[PDB]
Paper text:
Two sequanamycin derivatives, SEQ-569 and SEQ-977, discovered through serial synthetic modifications of SEQ-503, showed improved potency against the Mtb H37Rv strain (MIC: 0.57 and 0.13 μM, respectively). We succeeded in co-crystallizing SEQ-569 and SEQ-977 bound to the T. thermophilus 70S ribosomes. The structures contained tRNAPhe in all three tRNA binding sites and mRNA specifically constructed to mimic the state of the ribosome after several rounds of translation. Overall, the structures were similar to that of the T. thermophilus ribosome with erythromycin, and the active sites displayed clear electron density for sequanamycin in the macrolide binding pocket. The C5 ketoallose forms a hydrogen bond with A2058, with the hydrophobic C4-C8 edge of the central lactone making contact with the peptide wall, in an analogous manner to erythromycin. The mycinose group hydrogen bonds with Arg92 of the L22. In addition, G748 forms a hydrogen bond with the 5′′′-methoxy group that sits in a cavity formed by G748 and A752. The overall structure of SEQ-977 bound to the ribosome is similar to that of SEQ-569 except for the carbamate group at C8, on which the NH of the sulfonylamide group forms a hydrogen bond with N1 of A2062. This interaction causes A2062 to orient itself differently in the SEQ-977 co-crystal structure, compared with SEQ-569. The additional hydrogen bond may explain the increased potency of SEQ-977 (IC50 = 0.034 μM, MIC = 0.13 μM) over SEQ-569 (IC50 = 0.054 μM, MIC = 0.57 μM).
Here, we report the discovery of a series of macrolides called sequanamycins with outstanding in vitro and in vivo activity against Mycobacterium tuberculosis (Mtb). Sequanamycins are bacterial ribosome inhibitors that interact with the ribosome in a similar manner to classic macrolides like erythromycin and clarithromycin, but with binding characteristics that allow them to overcome the inherent macrolide resistance of Mtb. Members of the sequanamycin family bind in the same pocket of the ribosome as erythromycin. Like other macrolides, the sequanamycins bind in a narrow part of the peptide exit tunnel at a site that lies between the peptidyl transferase center and a constriction in the tunnel that occludes the lumen, near ribosomal proteins L4 and L22.
Numbering used by the authors:
A (entry chain L34A): 1 to 48
B (entry chain L2A): 2 to 273
Amino acid sequence: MKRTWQPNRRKRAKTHGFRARMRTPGGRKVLKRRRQKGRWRLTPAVRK
Amino acid sequence: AVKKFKPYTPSRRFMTVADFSEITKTEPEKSLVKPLKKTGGRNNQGRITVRFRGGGHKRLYRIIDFKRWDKVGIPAKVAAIEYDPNRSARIALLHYVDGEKRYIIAPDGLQVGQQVVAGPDAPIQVGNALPLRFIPVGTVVHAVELEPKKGAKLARAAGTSAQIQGREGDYVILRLPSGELRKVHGECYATVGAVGNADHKNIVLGKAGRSRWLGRRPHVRGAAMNPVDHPHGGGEGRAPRGRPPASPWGWQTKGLKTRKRRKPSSRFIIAR
RNA sequence: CACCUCGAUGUCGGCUCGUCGCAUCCUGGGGCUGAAGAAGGUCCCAAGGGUUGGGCUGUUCGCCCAUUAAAGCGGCACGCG
RNA sequence: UGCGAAUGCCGGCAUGAGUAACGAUAAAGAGGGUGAGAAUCCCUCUCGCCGUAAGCCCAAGGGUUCCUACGCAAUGGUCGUCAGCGUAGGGUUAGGCGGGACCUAAGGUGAAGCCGAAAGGCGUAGCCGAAGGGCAGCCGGUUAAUAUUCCGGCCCUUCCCGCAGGUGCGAUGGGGGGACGCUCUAGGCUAGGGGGACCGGAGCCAUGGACGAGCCCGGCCAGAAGCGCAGGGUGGGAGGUAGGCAAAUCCGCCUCCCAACAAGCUCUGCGUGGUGGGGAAGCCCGUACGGGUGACAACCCCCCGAAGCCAGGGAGCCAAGAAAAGCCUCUAAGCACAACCUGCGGGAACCCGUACCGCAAACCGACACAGGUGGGCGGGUGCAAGAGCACUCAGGCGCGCGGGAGAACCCUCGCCAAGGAACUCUGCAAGUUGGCCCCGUAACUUCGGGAGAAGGGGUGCUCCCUGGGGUGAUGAGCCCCGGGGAGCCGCAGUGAACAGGCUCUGGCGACUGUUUACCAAAAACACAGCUCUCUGCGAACUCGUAAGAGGAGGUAUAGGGAGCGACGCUUGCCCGGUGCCGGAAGGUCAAGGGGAGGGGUGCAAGCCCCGAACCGAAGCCCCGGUGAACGGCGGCCGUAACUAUAACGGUCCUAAGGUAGCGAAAUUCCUUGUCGGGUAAGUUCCGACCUGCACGAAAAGCGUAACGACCGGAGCGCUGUCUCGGCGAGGGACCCGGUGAAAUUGAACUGGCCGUGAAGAUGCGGCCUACCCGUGGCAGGACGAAAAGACCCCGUGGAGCUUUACUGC
RNA sequence: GCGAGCUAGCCCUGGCCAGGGUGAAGCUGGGGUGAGACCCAGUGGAGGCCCGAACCGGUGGGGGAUGCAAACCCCUCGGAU
RNA sequence: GUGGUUCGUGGAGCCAUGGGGGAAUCUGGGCGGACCACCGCCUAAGGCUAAGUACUCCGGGUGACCGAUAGCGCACCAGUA
RNA sequence: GCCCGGAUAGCUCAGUCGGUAGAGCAGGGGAUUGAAAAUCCCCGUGUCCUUGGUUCGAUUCCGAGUCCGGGCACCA
RNA sequence: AAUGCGCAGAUACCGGGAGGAACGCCGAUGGCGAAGGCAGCCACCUGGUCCACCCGUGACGCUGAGGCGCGAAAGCGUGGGGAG
Ligand SMILES: [K+]
Ligand SMILES: [K+]
Ligand SMILES: [K+]
Ligand SMILES: [K+]
Ligand SMILES: [K+]
Ligand SMILES: [K+]
Ligand SMILES: [K+]
Ligand SMILES: [K+]
Ligand SMILES: [K+]
Ligand SMILES: [K+]
Ligand SMILES: [K+]
Ligand SMILES: [K+]
Ligand SMILES: [K+]
Ligand SMILES: [K+]
Ligand SMILES: [K+]
Ligand SMILES: [K+]
Ligand SMILES: [K+]
Ligand SMILES: [K+]
Ligand SMILES: [K+]
Ligand SMILES: [K+]
Ligand SMILES: [K+]
Ligand SMILES: [K+]
Ligand SMILES: [K+]
Ligand SMILES: [K+]
Ligand SMILES: [K+]
Ligand SMILES: [K+]
Ligand SMILES: [K+]
Ligand SMILES: [K+]
Ligand SMILES: [K+]
Ligand SMILES: [K+]
Ligand SMILES: [K+]
Ligand SMILES: [K+]
Ligand SMILES: [K+]
Ligand SMILES: [K+]
Ligand SMILES: [K+]
Ligand SMILES: [K+]
Ligand SMILES: [K+]
Ligand SMILES: [K+]
Ligand SMILES: [K+]
Ligand SMILES: [K+]
Ligand SMILES: [K+]
Ligand SMILES: [K+]
Ligand SMILES: [K+]
Ligand SMILES: [K+]
Ligand SMILES: [K+]
Ligand SMILES: [K+]
Ligand SMILES: [Mg+2]
Ligand SMILES: [Mg+2]
Ligand SMILES: [Mg+2]
Ligand SMILES: [Mg+2]
Ligand SMILES: [Mg+2]
Ligand SMILES: [Mg+2]
Ligand SMILES: [Mg+2]
Ligand SMILES: [Mg+2]
Ligand SMILES: [Mg+2]
Ligand SMILES: [Mg+2]
Ligand SMILES: [Mg+2]
Ligand SMILES: [Mg+2]
Ligand SMILES: [Mg+2]
Ligand SMILES: [Mg+2]
Ligand SMILES: [Mg+2]
Ligand SMILES: [Mg+2]
Ligand SMILES: [Mg+2]
Ligand SMILES: [Mg+2]
Ligand SMILES: [Mg+2]
Ligand SMILES: [Mg+2]
Ligand SMILES: [Mg+2]
Ligand SMILES: [Mg+2]
Ligand SMILES: [Mg+2]
Ligand SMILES: [Mg+2]
Ligand SMILES: [Mg+2]
Ligand SMILES: [Mg+2]
Ligand SMILES: [Mg+2]
Ligand SMILES: [Mg+2]
Ligand SMILES: [Mg+2]
Ligand SMILES: [Mg+2]
Ligand SMILES: [Mg+2]
Ligand SMILES: [Mg+2]
Ligand SMILES: [Mg+2]
Ligand SMILES: [Mg+2]
Ligand SMILES: [Mg+2]
Ligand SMILES: [Mg+2]
Ligand SMILES: [Mg+2]
Ligand SMILES: [Mg+2]
Ligand SMILES: [Mg+2]
Ligand SMILES: [Mg+2]
Ligand SMILES: [Mg+2]
Ligand SMILES: [Mg+2]
Ligand SMILES: [Mg+2]
Ligand SMILES: [Mg+2]
Ligand SMILES: [Mg+2]
Ligand SMILES: [Mg+2]
Ligand SMILES: [Mg+2]
Ligand SMILES: [Mg+2]
Ligand SMILES: [Mg+2]
Ligand SMILES: [Mg+2]
Ligand SMILES: [Mg+2]
Ligand SMILES: [Mg+2]
Ligand SMILES: [Mg+2]
Ligand SMILES: [Mg+2]
Ligand SMILES: [Mg+2]
Ligand SMILES: [Mg+2]
Ligand SMILES: [Mg+2]
Ligand SMILES: [Mg+2]
Ligand SMILES: [Mg+2]
Ligand SMILES: [Mg+2]
Ligand SMILES: [Mg+2]
Ligand SMILES: [Mg+2]
Ligand SMILES: [Mg+2]
Ligand SMILES: [Mg+2]
Ligand SMILES: [Mg+2]
Ligand SMILES: [Mg+2]
Ligand SMILES: [Mg+2]
Ligand SMILES: [Mg+2]
Ligand SMILES: [Mg+2]
Ligand SMILES: [Mg+2]
Ligand SMILES: [Mg+2]
Ligand SMILES: [Mg+2]
Ligand SMILES: [Mg+2]
Ligand SMILES: [Mg+2]
Ligand SMILES: [Mg+2]
Ligand SMILES: [Mg+2]
Ligand SMILES: [Mg+2]
Ligand SMILES: [Mg+2]
Ligand SMILES: [Mg+2]
Ligand SMILES: [Mg+2]
Ligand SMILES: [Mg+2]
Ligand SMILES: [Mg+2]
Ligand SMILES: [Mg+2]
Ligand SMILES: [Mg+2]
Ligand SMILES: [Mg+2]
Ligand SMILES: [Mg+2]
Ligand SMILES: [Mg+2]
Ligand SMILES: [Mg+2]
Ligand SMILES: [Mg+2]
Ligand SMILES: [Mg+2]
Ligand SMILES: [Mg+2]
Ligand SMILES: [Mg+2]
Ligand SMILES: [Mg+2]
Ligand SMILES: [Mg+2]
Ligand SMILES: [Mg+2]
Ligand SMILES: [Mg+2]
Ligand SMILES: [Mg+2]
Ligand SMILES: [Mg+2]
Ligand SMILES: [Mg+2]
Ligand SMILES: [Mg+2]
Ligand SMILES: [Mg+2]
Ligand SMILES: [Mg+2]
Ligand SMILES: [Mg+2]
Ligand SMILES: [Mg+2]
Ligand SMILES: [Mg+2]
Ligand SMILES: [Mg+2]
Ligand SMILES: [Mg+2]
Ligand SMILES: [Mg+2]
Ligand SMILES: [Mg+2]
Ligand SMILES: [Mg+2]
Ligand SMILES: [Mg+2]
Ligand SMILES: [Mg+2]
Ligand SMILES: [Mg+2]
Ligand SMILES: [Mg+2]
Ligand SMILES: [Mg+2]
Ligand SMILES: [Mg+2]
Ligand SMILES: [Mg+2]
Ligand SMILES: [Mg+2]
Ligand SMILES: [Mg+2]
Ligand SMILES: [Mg+2]
Ligand SMILES: [Mg+2]
Ligand SMILES: [Mg+2]
Ligand SMILES: [Mg+2]
Ligand SMILES: [Mg+2]
Ligand SMILES: [Mg+2]
Ligand SMILES: [Mg+2]
Ligand SMILES: [Mg+2]
Ligand SMILES: [Mg+2]
Ligand SMILES: [Mg+2]
Ligand SMILES: [Mg+2]
Ligand SMILES: [Mg+2]
Ligand SMILES: [Mg+2]
Ligand SMILES: [Mg+2]
Ligand SMILES: [Mg+2]
Ligand SMILES: [Mg+2]
Ligand SMILES: [Mg+2]
Ligand SMILES: [Mg+2]
Ligand SMILES: [Mg+2]
Ligand SMILES: [Mg+2]
Ligand SMILES: [Mg+2]
Ligand SMILES: [Mg+2]
Ligand SMILES: [Mg+2]
Ligand SMILES: [Mg+2]
Ligand SMILES: [Mg+2]
Ligand SMILES: [Mg+2]
């Protein structure tokens, strides 16, 4: 049937994107933690 | 006058639509229409603050004149009477002689062509707005300002009307469509007559769908829910109220009075 | 009563499939009779085989309808998911 | 710091086992080629399948999967020489297509401003934001792979700078416009389609016949100006002018005029059109595929015809149907040796996307997964129509294991003698019925329905006659709707396929709707409608600490809350308790006020403690009201001239003791109540009675036409449902070749009976049976597997829910 | 702190619903009357109207149950301005 | 009305402060645990101030610390697949 | 089968601190009436259900028993 | 008599206001209408009737099954109103 992943490149960057994170202090802290852990990508990989 | 239907389908038995005879113009005054944001009952957080609201025909706001003194003594000819999807009443389009066109809420009796005018001058005739203090006692009157220059706010629904009962200094004694007796300041404007489209109260929607067209979504009884949702929810089968009848927010809903007692306006009220 | 089983022994009835017991419903053998005959009554031997189709109710049971030599009772985790 | 257990952790390797599977029952066969190797790759022929798709084009998503060359370890459910796989190389070209140097929508953001302990929340303008608005490219050819992108032909747009000619020019400001619903719809066209006796074309004459106006193939596409043919939009002048937040000559308003179902201006569509392209079958080409020829190809006539175009067309209706820019006009500063407008020239015209998949082996589903995925095209013939069904074009496919075999059993399917629900919880299932035309059609009804009620008759082909339409012309042709009469053949003419079984009677719910994604679709929710209640507008109410927002740019014919749930006839009594409402008195009552009077220290002046009256709100008490507010709505004894029963009486209690109507009911325990009906037989069903365990009037009472994948009872029709089974088909199951799992598993050399044993033993006792090992089958046992039982209890375990439990907010 | 790319509601903007039936009002004509109501025709084309694809569903049954599938398949069924 | 302190209203002071009231400048004020008296200590409502103290992303030195299931999650292109 | 309530005049019922117990109706006797009612005057019988026990004394207090009324019989 | 109302300030009295219904005297055994029925006062629209005159038409008449219209009170529907 219709599964839970309905990909939408705008959705992805609008929701979990770098500019998305940087507005909320909750999301800036997401980057903080992700960098401190040394993730290769802080934000989900997206393609305009 | 009001249209009925033959029962060629169920819900057409009892369906009833208004009589659009007094309607003269179909498309509205383009220079006098705004778009209205449809809330679906949601506030500026994305939350519902009025339940069971949404859907319903797209509507275009007719910007209408509730302050009539900004054209004192300038008369105008009643050009049209048109449908307004945003109120119970019908609106009248009037062409002022100086070329401005405005929407007035159309009183009963008013028909196309007559002169109309606002101001302490004005003749006491249907359509004319005047400060209350110059409107003779016992005159039925609508679209009443509640405080001077704050705009008309009283009796503007179909077939509503206030009536002047007496005078007291700067105030005058009004009987409102709700039977309440209130003093209103004499300087408050009010166009004379009653609202009209007076048969609005007889239209019988007919089917559930017709409620949807007015943007009224279904409304579910507390008794139909569970205790998490409503004070009346739960039980086994059906179940009586089992307590003083209450709203979803737990306050009593039979008789319990809610006007703030300490309200300053209490000084100017005298009835029910 | 609370002995095995609550780190699980699926619970009524039906259907299918049976198998055994006998305290025998029928058929077979018999004693007594308040047994003329015919039909019974009751007890004895006997478990080889047989032991119907329908209405009602989920029903087991039971009651009816129509037959029958007869429309036996039980046990097998109230046999068998 | 010593491991055997912890349904312990990690890893490795077993068992089941060469076992189940190899992923749609659309289907294959042969020949040639290639290669170490071929059922599986290439090619030919034959066969099958899709064809409102299983073909083609967009969008999203994916991201090199595209093309070529070389490969086969692995991935591919087998094989592989093949690949969506490995290696390498190549490949995606735009002023006009999509998007950005344009607009605004919800929403987001957000100068000003408002709010919040901090983080932050709000917020007019502005900005951002699109599958909406605006805006200039069509068609062929070319490549292994791109093309509206390169090329060719023809045609446009914008910017800049010049000329030339015009005009008071000129905004982010004023106005017009853009600009709008649903349903139905006229005319004229276009796409698209069919026919042709005509134009063109290789060829063919088979097998009995046919050299014929024979068969087969094709007969077009893009196209500026100008011309037509349709349609859409729009009145022309003069005065007055206080409105459009300055100013307008513009708009609006007023008054004059001329004009008026038009015209004339425009604007779009369609046709023609310079020119430019295409151009079959077949046949020969060697391509996996394209080329050559057919050819100087022909390129016409008729008919059908949109849902598309003219389009802002028209009519009706109510629920009353975005915005902003481009665009036109108007004026303001400013400037008028500027500027703008109109043509014509030359120049200038950037960023990104463009491969390939794209109903799927490339997207979402862990898989080359029988699932899921939006827009457009979607031909032909027939069937009443149609996107329906059957076949079929273009195109695409045979589903990435095969070969046999011909058991049980399984699945999907076909038929069945006699019977026809006897099956069973239940006609579950399957059957029957089925399209169109015509005849006909009841109770009841809210007059619409019920109705497709029910039940019938017809349906093919041939010849003769014959009436209308549309198109041509009033005429022929081509279509479309028919009507009459003769006759032909079969078991059968909606000859295949698609296509209701019907009646009667109850319960519930008025109705179409809605719901437990994934065991409940319902009598549950909703619903129009009825009542109660709140709420005078900075409304009540809701969200938020707040600002603020929704309510509502609404105003008592309105909005919120509660119940009841079309409609019909109705909705009785009880206000003692609880709740809500009203009570300017009284009692009580907290802080506060007030201080009689006591007290501690000081030598005192003092300082400092308590503190009685009395004045003190809401609340409670108290007095009333209130039932579509929470709710409630009796007992015992007696009595009538046969009995029986009790209209009548007595008396106890209560706030008052259940009215109409209904009643063994979705309520009736006793119960299969009793009577009637249906049946041969009826714990069901229907009608009744009333003894109502334990109905009863808006948690509504009793009815009600119509509706229902709801639930019950009856019957007809018809059946493999059954007596009661049989045969057959295919897909599996079986054998062979290839690949090859799973839960489970203390170890096993794992029989029966009667006992015993923790009380149901392969494992102990006695006895009895019994050569070793497999294969196809069945399921009685291994208290078989699966899940640390969901029932039950326990734990001073946990959670959801309630309230006159406690305590708080 | 992260989630409405599934799902529920609402908001903005677009799109879809083959083909049949039924035949409300209104018109227009005729009758009717003092005038009407009303009646009959024809036209008209309304409806949470009817049949039925797409599309949205998920009624009954069978299959499936280490599945093709962690909700599928077949027949059947509901809605379809 | 509260917080802090050992101080949970307690005989409850001291320091802090949301609300109300509201002074004085040395013969002035605060404190020594209700309060008063005595006797003492201090000088509120302005500010700055090294060191001794805390920590370990990093550098070094050590180890009756590990030795690839240990030791950091990572000894290996790991916050990777 | 398991709990609670009651039993008093002929009927329906109050009642008690442990001593001689009343109400209403019915019934009886008188009155009024032509005669019945209705009205008026006057009149209780009670072994306070059975049985045991506490008392000086029990309808009263207690324990059982008959009888009646009410509530219960759940997961299963 | 009691229910009821009343020191929470009633009745009785004055003043202000709201509201609905019905129209005293005139008024009569009177008038009008076909009946049902009609009563303050003003206006508009409108029916019948009588009289005077003897002018017009010229039997155009009377009755009237059905049909159609009106029809006190009570009652019913949708709304409004609601003092007695
Ligand atoms: K509701
Ligand atoms: K409930
Ligand atoms: K157990
Ligand atoms: K036997
Ligand atoms: K047996
Ligand atoms: K089972
Ligand atoms: K282990
Ligand atoms: K093995
Ligand atoms: K390979
Ligand atoms: K596979
Ligand atoms: K756009
Ligand atoms: K402008
Ligand atoms: K042209
Ligand atoms: K391309
Ligand atoms: K097909
Ligand atoms: K075989
Ligand atoms: K049977
Ligand atoms: K059908
Ligand atoms: K039925
Ligand atoms: K009903
Ligand atoms: K349903
Ligand atoms: K529901
Ligand atoms: K608003
Ligand atoms: K009460
Ligand atoms: K009360
Ligand atoms: K009361
Ligand atoms: K005090
Ligand atoms: K009964
Ligand atoms: K009952
Ligand atoms: K009978
Ligand atoms: K009978
Ligand atoms: K249903
Ligand atoms: K077994
Ligand atoms: K406890
Ligand atoms: K229609
Ligand atoms: K303290
Ligand atoms: K201090
Ligand atoms: K001190
Ligand atoms: K000190
Ligand atoms: K410092
Ligand atoms: K290792
Ligand atoms: K590790
Ligand atoms: K009593
Ligand atoms: K007595
Ligand atoms: K008559
Ligand atoms: K009343
Ligand atoms: Mg997932
Ligand atoms: Mg890196
Ligand atoms: Mg506008
Ligand atoms: Mg519920
Ligand atoms: Mg919730
Ligand atoms: Mg609650
Ligand atoms: Mg409740
Ligand atoms: Mg529940
Ligand atoms: Mg209940
Ligand atoms: Mg109110
Ligand atoms: Mg035990
Ligand atoms: Mg076990
Ligand atoms: Mg036996
Ligand atoms: Mg024997
Ligand atoms: Mg036997
Ligand atoms: Mg039965
Ligand atoms: Mg029998
Ligand atoms: Mg037993
Ligand atoms: Mg037993
Ligand atoms: Mg059993
Ligand atoms: Mg081990
Ligand atoms: Mg390893
Ligand atoms: Mg095996
Ligand atoms: Mg096998
Ligand atoms: Mg196999
Ligand atoms: Mg396959
Ligand atoms: Mg071959
Ligand atoms: Mg082959
Ligand atoms: Mg394909
Ligand atoms: Mg992928
Ligand atoms: Mg390839
Ligand atoms: Mg190759
Ligand atoms: Mg392989
Ligand atoms: Mg390929
Ligand atoms: Mg490759
Ligand atoms: Mg630029
Ligand atoms: Mg913000
Ligand atoms: Mg913008
Ligand atoms: Mg666009
Ligand atoms: Mg091309
Ligand atoms: Mg390509
Ligand atoms: Mg091209
Ligand atoms: Mg100008
Ligand atoms: Mg064309
Ligand atoms: Mg054509
Ligand atoms: Mg055609
Ligand atoms: Mg030739
Ligand atoms: Mg021949
Ligand atoms: Mg020839
Ligand atoms: Mg020839
Ligand atoms: Mg063409
Ligand atoms: Mg003009
Ligand atoms: Mg101006
Ligand atoms: Mg024109
Ligand atoms: Mg050539
Ligand atoms: Mg139009
Ligand atoms: Mg702008
Ligand atoms: Mg040019
Ligand atoms: Mg492409
Ligand atoms: Mg593919
Ligand atoms: Mg493809
Ligand atoms: Mg493709
Ligand atoms: Mg598609
Ligand atoms: Mg494919
Ligand atoms: Mg494809
Ligand atoms: Mg495959
Ligand atoms: Mg697939
Ligand atoms: Mg996939
Ligand atoms: Mg097709
Ligand atoms: Mg056709
Ligand atoms: Mg057809
Ligand atoms: Mg098809
Ligand atoms: Mg083909
Ligand atoms: Mg397939
Ligand atoms: Mg048969
Ligand atoms: Mg037969
Ligand atoms: Mg028959
Ligand atoms: Mg039967
Ligand atoms: Mg069936
Ligand atoms: Mg069928
Ligand atoms: Mg009938
Ligand atoms: Mg009819
Ligand atoms: Mg009919
Ligand atoms: Mg034939
Ligand atoms: Mg059929
Ligand atoms: Mg149907
Ligand atoms: Mg029943
Ligand atoms: Mg329903
Ligand atoms: Mg329907
Ligand atoms: Mg469900
Ligand atoms: Mg659903
Ligand atoms: Mg189900
Ligand atoms: Mg279901
Ligand atoms: Mg607001
Ligand atoms: Mg209800
Ligand atoms: Mg004091
Ligand atoms: Mg008080
Ligand atoms: Mg009270
Ligand atoms: Mg009631
Ligand atoms: Mg009830
Ligand atoms: Mg009720
Ligand atoms: Mg109901
Ligand atoms: Mg009923
Ligand atoms: Mg009914
Ligand atoms: Mg339905
Ligand atoms: Mg069978
Ligand atoms: Mg067979
Ligand atoms: Mg095998
Ligand atoms: Mg052995
Ligand atoms: Mg044993
Ligand atoms: Mg041994
Ligand atoms: Mg031993
Ligand atoms: Mg042994
Ligand atoms: Mg043994
Ligand atoms: Mg075996
Ligand atoms: Mg074996
Ligand atoms: Mg088996
Ligand atoms: Mg087990
Ligand atoms: Mg468990
Ligand atoms: Mg357990
Ligand atoms: Mg459970
Ligand atoms: Mg506990
Ligand atoms: Mg606990
Ligand atoms: Mg979503
Ligand atoms: Mg959503
Ligand atoms: Mg419909
Ligand atoms: Mg349908
Ligand atoms: Mg479509
Ligand atoms: Mg869907
Ligand atoms: Mg299903
Ligand atoms: Mg369907
Ligand atoms: Mg503290
Ligand atoms: Mg001290
Ligand atoms: Mg070492
Ligand atoms: Mg490691
Ligand atoms: Mg490692
Ligand atoms: Mg007694
Ligand atoms: Mg005694
Ligand atoms: Mg008159
Ligand atoms: Mg004369
Ligand atoms: Mg009447
Ligand atoms: Mg009346
Ligand atoms: Mg009435
Ligand atoms: Mg009534
Ligand atoms: Mg009323």
